[PDB]
Structures are given as structure tokens and as C-alpha cells.
């Protein structure tokens, strides 16, 4: 996250990280045993970490849980990035407490201007590298379909939406992928892609979680 701030302790207790020897993506905890992430974060073996604040210093209440199932949406399109979503089933139930808990699925698709919270351990620099150990947060608004489409001509499917600032300076960035965009207690978005990070007229693009609510429910029901 570029232009964000250090999240308040315990303010984002649904944020998880995906690990394969190092932290490569984020995710959101939706159920004691299920995490939503991006399809492009797919790897064949993933350790989920929950309750992290500083990813370099174990503080007390973190849990590391191996992924038992890693289920990329079967129509994820490696070219257009449509259906960029993935479910992970944890091999053990997460402990739910002050530091770790679940986020609800959306009851409606995103609404323009809604004030949302984007979080992750992505790069804080729009040019070069400045990767933070402490979890970052960014307050950002849902952008109109018009603006999203004008930013990325021809590229914005019905399963994507844009959140952020056309002036630049504030955005998600590398290592935020798969992490949450939360608006009014609901997971609206999955961090997905952008033309760089925090550039003028190039807001971040996010997977539209509402469109996958039935796929998510059916997939969980089938693997329970």
C-alpha cells in the first residue's frame, strides 16, 4: 500500500498472508476454515498466516495454518484477468479472538463513492522498493464504472471494479494481491491488478466479490 498508514492494532483481524517460504500475497478470512484470495496468487503449497501485525516479529497470538485445499476459480483468464479469485480451505480451524476473525460476504455489488478500507503488506513506494513489515491500511472510495473504464479502456470486465484516487499517490501495490477491500463490514474486493501503483489515472482494479458469492457458497458446501 502506497500512501497509506499503519493499521491500528487489531483493526483488520480478517487479514491473512499467503506464504511459500516468504510472504507473497494477502487474503481475507471469511469462515473459520476458509480464505478468499486472488487467482493469480495460486501456488500448489501455501501456508496461511493469521493474526500478523509485523510480519518480521512474532508477537504472540499468530497462527500459521497450512492450506488443505487451494481452489482457483476454474474460469480465471490468464490474459484478461477475469475471475481473478481463489478459495483456500485451511487444514485446521482458525482460532477466533480479538486478533483474528472473519469478514462477511457482500449483500450487494459495490456502490460508487462508498468509503472502503484496503489493507496489506504491499510495497509503499510507487517507484522502487520499500516493503513494510507492519500491516498498512488505506481509506479509499469506490470509483464510478465510467472512471474505471476510462482508466483502463476495454479492460474492465463486469467482474472488476476500481477503488482509489485518479490523482495518484494512494493505491495497493505488489504483495497486497489477494487482500481485502472492505466496505461497511463486507468484503467487496480482492486486490488484483493495476498499471503500476499509485500513478495518475491508473487506480487499482479489484475483483468484484459479490459476483462470486454463489460460487463461494457452493464451493465451501461441496468441500465440507
Amino acid at each position: 500500500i502506497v500512501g497509506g498508514y499503519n493499521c491500528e492494532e487489531n483493526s483488520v483481524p480478517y487479514q491473512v498472508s499467503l506464504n511459500s517460504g516468504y510472504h507473497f500475497c494477502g487474503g481475507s478470512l471469511i469462515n473459520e476454515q476458509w480464505v478468499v484470495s486472488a487467482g493469480h496468487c495460486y501456488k500448489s503449497r501455501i501456508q496461511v498466516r493469521l493474526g500478523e501485525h509485523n510480519i518480521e516479529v512474532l508477537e504472540g497470538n499468530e497462527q500459521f495454518i497450512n492450506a488443505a485445499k487451494i481452489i482457483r476459480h476454474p474460469q480465471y483468464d490468464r490474459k484478461t484477468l477475469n475471475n481473478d479469485i481463489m478459495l483456500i480451505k485451511l487444514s485446521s480451524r482458525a482460532v477466533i479472538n480479538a486478533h483474528v476473525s472473519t469478514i462477511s460476504l457482500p449483500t450487494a455489488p459495490p456502490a460508487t463513492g462508498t468509503k472502503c478500507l484496503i489493507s496489506g503488506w504491499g510495497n509503499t513506494a510507487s517507484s522502487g522498493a520499500d516493503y513494510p513489515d507492519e500491516l498498512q491500511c488505506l481509506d479509499a472510495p469506490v470509483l464510478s464504472q465510467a472512471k474505471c473504464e476510462a482508466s483502463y479502456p476495454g479492460k474492465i470486465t463486469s467482474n472488476m471494479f476500481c477503488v482509489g484516487f485518479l490523482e495518484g499517490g494512494k493505491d495497493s501495490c505488489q504483495r497486497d494481491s489477494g487482500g481485502p477491500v472492505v466496505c461497511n463490514g463486507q468484503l467487496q474486493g480482492v486486490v488484483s491488478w493495476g498499471d503500476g501503483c499509485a500513478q495518475k489515472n491508473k487506480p487499482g482494479v479489484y475483483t468484484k466479490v459479490y459476483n462470486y458469492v454463489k460460487w463461494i457458497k457452493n464451493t465451501i458446501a461441496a468441500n465440507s
Binding site: 507473497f24 493469480h40 490468464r78 516493503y131 505488489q174 494481491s177 491488478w193 503500476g196 501503483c197
Partner: protein, 58 residues
């Protein structure tokens, strides 16, 4: 070695931080870079050994 081995490393538009290898023709060595998770070019390998094998890292 294939021509694709001569291209600069390409992070792409996705926002993962996945560590990949690319053949660095200027330095003559397989070197790490950040791949964002999508739209990889061919000078992008999952290991140093894959990169050396494919891009003539003698």
C-alpha cells in the same frame, strides 16, 4: 540461447510479490526479480536451475 532470454524482467500488472528468476544478459547471470503473478514473459523462471538450463547459464 533463446532471444527471450535477452529481454528485461517483467513484473506485470498484478500485485503479488512472487520471487522469480530472469537471465540478466548484461551480468551474464540468472538474477531474482519481483513477478506480480500475471502476464509473465518467457524470461521468468521458478528457480535458478530452470533459468540456467534454459537461458545458457554455463
Amino acid at each position: 540461447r533463446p532471444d527471450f532470454c535477452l529481454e528485461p524482467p517483467y513484473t506485470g500488472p498484478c500485485k503479488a510479490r512472487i520471487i522469480r528468476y530472469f537471465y540478466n544478459a548484461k551480468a551474464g547471470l540468472c538474477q531474482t526479480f519481483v513477478y506480480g503473478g500475471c502476464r509473465a514473459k518467457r524470461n521468468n523462471f521458478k528457480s535458478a536451475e530452470d533459468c540456467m538450463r534454459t537461458c545458457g547459464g554455463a
